[PDB]
Amino acid sequence: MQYKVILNGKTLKGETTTEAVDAATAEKVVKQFFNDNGVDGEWTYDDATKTFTVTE
Amino acid sequence: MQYKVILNGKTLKGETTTEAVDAATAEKVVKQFFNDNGVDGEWTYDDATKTFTVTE
Numbered sequence: 001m002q003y004k005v006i007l008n009g010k011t012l013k014g015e016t017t018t019e020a021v022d023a024a025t026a027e028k029v030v031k032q033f034f035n036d037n038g039v040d041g042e043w044t045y046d047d048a049t050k051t052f053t054v055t056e
Numbered sequence: 057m058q059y060k061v062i063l064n065g066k067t068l069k070g071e072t073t074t075e076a077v078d079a080a081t082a083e084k085v086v087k088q089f090f091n092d093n094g095v096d097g098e099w100t101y102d103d104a105t106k107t108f109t110v111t112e
Contacts, residue, residue: 004105007063007072009112012089014072016063023101027108031095033068034110038094039087045079049060052083054090056065 005030032056061086088112 003026005016018033020026037054044053059082061072074089076082093110100109 001106004107005068005070006107006109007070007089007093008109009074009089009093011076011085012061012072012074012112014061014063014070016068016070016072018065018068020067023103023106027099027101029067030099030108033063033065034090034093034097035095037063037065037090039091041090043083043086045083047079050057050079051060051062052086053062053064056068 001026057082 002019005018007014007016018026018029020029036056042055058075061074063070074082074085076085092112098111
């Protein structure tokens with residue numbers, strides 16, 4: 001199933017969607033996302049659109 | 057200024073927006089987001105909408 005994850009922060013806000021057999025799997029899959037995005041992830045920047053693309 | 061951050065993963069995909077004086081500040085602010093969301097963040101779930109809300 002598909003789940004809609006909301007990344008609501010103070011200086012950062014957004015919406016994302018992970019696909020997992022269940023909410024837990026999704027929750028876990030998401031954890032891996034941030035777990036890997038966190039502070040050692042590969043962040044690419046696109047000045048052309050002032051947008052950054054965090055690729056797992 | 058406002059920046060549009062794209063969280064593009066394999067099993068997870070989405071879009072977010074951080075506000076920072078510059079791209080770097082934004083990038084840094086975002087890092088704090090994931091840095092704090094990562095594996096020890098406070099994740100709240102809303103079954104009513106199958107949506108999770110990660111609050112910094």
